[PDB]
Amino acid sequence: MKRIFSLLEKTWLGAPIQFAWQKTSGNYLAVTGADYIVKIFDRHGQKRSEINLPGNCVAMDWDKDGDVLAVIAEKSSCIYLWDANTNKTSQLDNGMRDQMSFLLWSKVGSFLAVGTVKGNLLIYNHQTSRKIPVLGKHTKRITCGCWNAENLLALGGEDKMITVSNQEGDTIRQTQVRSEPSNMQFFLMKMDDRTSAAESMISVVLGKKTLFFLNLNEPDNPADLEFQQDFGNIVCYNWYGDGRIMIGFSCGHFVVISTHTGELGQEIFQARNHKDNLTSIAVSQTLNKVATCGDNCIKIQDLVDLKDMYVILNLDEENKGLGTLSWTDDGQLLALSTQRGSLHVFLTKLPILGDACSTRIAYLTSLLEVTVANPVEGELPITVSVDVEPNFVAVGLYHLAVGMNNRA
């Protein structure tokens, strides 16, 4: 693992940043701090675009293809939409009277959800330009939510309610919870019968202390998991494999639990990876690995055997107070924020891009360097510097091609 770049803007020093990777291609990284700007970087750390806001960024998210970034701000009714293929910004007025509090795209349809401080919801379809306002969805601030594989939307609010909806904003289900919902995620229970494929169940963190479960097929029997007070508060959690959750806790501990029928909440594994503080976990199902950050270090482990430490990185004393981790969906890059307002990006895996024509081969050797060789004829390897990170490479008798999205 090598550090590719670091962002240290003077305007961010002393305040926690927020950031988001582009969802399929991973070419762009959106970042914001206390300066009322969202800055869009390429994967080399060069600034490609900026979005000015009338107040703090409240939330940001990318569409299912990564073609569009959505942003919401304090004291604004406008959603800001930025397009990765044109580099342009546009504005979309929410049509409600209110300050926004939540933002999330579907993984399957071109649908964007927006929540408000008064508990109103808007769904926007980007392909049809259709707006769907839903007044009174919650009685207080919408705080969290998730989109299903079937384009169902689930939402939590400060009114201690959970609501489940279709893509047309209609309420399918409502439920009351013991404390404020946070970090909500949809999933599928793997029953022994192969015949069910829909994500029938929701997971959520209540009060930063308990993980709660709601089944849409059995809504009269929800489940609460409590954890040892010595672990501290739930900081984050992620889904893995067939029916597992990994949960990170503030006092340096993480836990893995089973969610299979008759073992729901059984602890499979536990570790104190960090002595004093754990601040984020990020799981890549693409690489089959997890990163954890705490005590000014990053620790990376195999999801097949969590005892096998892949990498430990220590970070210099300027970086005190780690923030959030997130990978690109190709599992090529890891980003880390700090509570002091810096961002750092690391190479987790070189892309295995290569091609052949007769005895001549081309292959990626660094993120911007393709090497061409002919190991049969004994020709010395030729190193080609390239202007972009390629998503594909091809070679001929006399030429090399590399390309990304719709360009070569």
CB 50 within 8 A of CB 7: no
> Across-strand partners of 142?
157
DSSP conformation class of 404: B
DSSP conformation class of 408: -
Q: Would you list the DSSP string of 84-125?
A: TTT--EEEEE--SSS-EEEEEE-SSSSEEEEEETTS-EEEEE
Q: Which of 152, 205, 200 is nearest to 183 (CA)?
A: 205
CB 64 within 8 A of CB 23: yes
Q: Which of 77, 186, 57, 284 is nearest to 69 (CA)?
A: 57
Cβ neighbors of 157 (< 8 A, separation 6 or more) are: 115, 119, 138, 139, 140, 141, 142, 143, 163, 181
Backbone angles phi, psi at 281, to 5 degrees: -125, 140
Q: Is 133 helix (H, G, I), strand (E, B) or coil?
A: strand
Q: How far is CA 109 from CA 83, 101, 173, in A?
A: 17, 22, 21
CB 189 within 8 A of CB 201: yes
> Across-strand partners of 7?
343
Q: State the Cα–Cα distance between residues 111 and 132, nearest whole angstrom.
A: 10
Q: Read off the tokens for 190.
A: 């793997």
Q: State the Cα–Cα distance between residues 89 and 271, nearest whole angstrom.
A: 45
CB 294 within 8 A of CB 278: yes
| Tokens 């990498």, residue located | 311
Q: Read off the tokens for 26.
A: 């991973």
Q: State the Cα–Cα distance between residues 174 and 164, nearest whole angstrom.
A: 6
CB 100 within 8 A of CB 58: yes
Q: How far is CA 348 from CA 45, 157, 284, 308, 323, in A?
A: 16, 36, 11, 16, 19
Q: State the Cα–Cα distance between residues 212 and 53, nearest whole angstrom.
A: 35
**In terms of residues, how long is the chain?**
408
DSSP conformation class of 317: G
CB 102 within 8 A of CB 89: no
| Sheet arrangement for strand 37-42 | 18-21, 28-32, 37-42, 47-52
Q: Read off the tokens for 299.
A: 């620790």
CB 292 within 8 A of CB 334: no
| C-alpha R_g of the chain | 22
CB 286 within 8 A of CB 331: yes
**Resolution of the coordinates, Å:** 3.5
DSSP conformation class of 398: S
